[PDB]
Design an enzyme around this catalytic site. Structure first.
Site, short mmCIF file in Angstrom:
data_model
loop_
_atom_site.label_atom_id
_atom_site.label_comp_id
_atom_site.label_asym_id
_atom_site.label_seq_id
_atom_site.Cartn_x
_atom_site.Cartn_y
_atom_site.Cartn_z
N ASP A 193 0.11 -7.43 2.28
CA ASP A 193 0.58 -6.07 2.18
C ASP A 193 2.10 -5.98 2.37
OD1 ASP A 193 0.64 -3.26 2.08
OD2 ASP A 193 -0.37 -2.99 3.92
N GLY B 85 1.85 7.21 8.47
CA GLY B 85 3.18 7.68 8.25
C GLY B 85 4.22 6.68 8.72
N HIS C 254 0.81 -1.22 0.00
CA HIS C 254 0.00 0.00 0.00
C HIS C 254 0.84 1.26 0.00
CE1 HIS C 254 -0.08 0.56 4.72
NE2 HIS C 254 -0.26 1.80 4.32
N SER D 162 3.56 3.43 8.22
CA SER D 162 3.40 2.37 7.22
C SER D 162 4.62 1.93 6.44
CB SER D 162 2.33 2.79 6.24
OG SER D 162 1.11 2.48 6.90
N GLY D 163 4.72 0.61 6.22
CA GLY D 163 5.83 -0.02 5.50
C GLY D 163 7.04 -0.24 6.38
N1 LIG Z 1 -3.13 1.83 14.40
C1 LIG Z 1 -2.06 1.66 13.61
N2 LIG Z 1 -1.02 0.92 14.05
C2 LIG Z 1 -2.12 2.02 12.24
C3 LIG Z 1 -3.30 2.51 11.66
C4 LIG Z 1 -3.34 2.91 10.32
C5 LIG Z 1 -2.18 2.84 9.53
N3 LIG Z 1 -2.22 3.23 8.24
C6 LIG Z 1 -3.07 2.78 7.31
O1 LIG Z 1 -3.98 1.97 7.57
N4 LIG Z 1 -2.89 3.21 6.06
C7 LIG Z 1 -3.63 2.90 5.00
C8 LIG Z 1 -3.85 1.57 4.69
C9 LIG Z 1 -4.55 1.28 3.51
C10 LIG Z 1 -5.01 2.31 2.68
O2 LIG Z 1 -5.70 1.99 1.55
C11 LIG Z 1 -5.38 2.17 0.24
C12 LIG Z 1 -6.22 1.61 -0.73
C13 LIG Z 1 -5.94 1.77 -2.09
C14 LIG Z 1 -4.81 2.50 -2.49
C15 LIG Z 1 -3.97 3.06 -1.53
C16 LIG Z 1 -4.24 2.90 -0.17
C17 LIG Z 1 -4.75 3.65 3.03
C18 LIG Z 1 -4.06 3.96 4.20
C19 LIG Z 1 -0.99 2.35 10.08
C20 LIG Z 1 -0.97 1.95 11.41
#
Ligand SMILES: N=C(N)c1ccc(NC(=O)Nc2ccc(Oc3ccccc3)cc2)cc1
Ligand SMILES: [Ca+2]
Length: 223
Positions: free
Chosen positions: A84, A175, A40, A177-178
């Site tokens: 992911d 932020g 993602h 993420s990854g």
């Molecule tokens: N509580 C946490 N540890 C936590 C919560 C949220 C994230 N971030 C997150 O969920 N990001 C995210 C995931 C998928 C997304 O979905 C997409 C779908 C299609 C294209 C791009 C992103 C968008 C943001 C990271 C850690």
């Protein structure tokens, strides 16, 4: 990272910042030419920034290497965030040393109860937004599969695990993420998703890296 602490400069030598004009995701260096991150976080025009502590100031230990190719896991589903994971190759190999180092891939999956280190330059607030300039760290346990599935019913596949604190207050966030979840010196998770950050009963969910070792190795062997 919400409720974490300042890591200390270059104390997490495998932590990577993916930058496309700005930091948008973390990553982990696994050998001199490859970084693993979340699928993602895929984007064209990635520059990998290694040796970072304050991502806004050039401090002396950074290596800035553009990505030559990205490989999103073939079965990644963006809607469920199942699988992911993604691999990024650097156009030139990084110079490895004490401050820029690769992290080992796991030989076995980690178990519930193991304390792990999660790090990133993500949001440090559950209500509000404040992005640090320096790397934050959180020590957190892997939670059981049953408490993960009780917290997110019908969403946890076999390629995901939860880690954190069901009381809230301490978690990864947007932020982050990854980025890495390292347990006993092995990369066991990738920061992937969660509902909000640091909320009660909504722990972080992480890609389960041990399920991907043959794919990572095979892919690196031919690319
Ligand atoms: N509580 C946490 N540890 C936590 C919560 C949220 C994230 N971030 C997150 O969920 N990001 C995210 C995931 C998928 C997304 O979905 C997409 C779908 C299609 C294209 C791009 C992103 C968008 C943001 C990271 C850690
Ligand atoms: Ca810097």
């Amino acid at each position: 990272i919400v409720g974490g602490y300042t890591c200390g400069a270059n104390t997490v030598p495998y932590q990577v910042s993916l930058n496309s004009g700005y930091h948008f995701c973390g990553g982990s260096l696994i050998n001199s030419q490859w970084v693993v991150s979340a699928a993602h976080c895929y984007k064209s025009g990635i520059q990998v920034r290694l040796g970072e502590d304050n991502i806004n100031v050039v401090e002396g230990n950074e290596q800035f290497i553009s990505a030559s190719k990205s490989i999103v896991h073939p079965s990644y589903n963006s809607n469920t965030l199942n699988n992911d994971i993604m691999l990024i190759k650097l156009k030139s190999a990084a110079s490895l040393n004490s401050r820029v180092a690769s992290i080992s891939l796991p030989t076995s999956c980690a178990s519930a109860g193991t304390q792990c280190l999660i790090s990133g330059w993500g949001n440090t607030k559950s209500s509000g937004t404040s992005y640090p300039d320096v790397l934050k760290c959180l020590k957190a346990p892997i939670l059981s599969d049953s408490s993960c599935k009780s917290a997110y019913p019908g969403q946890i596949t076999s390629n995901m695990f939860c880690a954190g604190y069901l009381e809230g207050g301490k978690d990864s966030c947007q932020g982050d993420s990854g980025g890495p979840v390292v347990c006993s010196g092995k990369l066991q998770g990738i920061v992937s998703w969660g509902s909000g950050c640091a909320q009660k009963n909504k722990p972080g969910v992480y890609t389960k890296v041990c399920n991907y070792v043959s794919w990572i190795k095979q892919t690196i062997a031919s690319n």
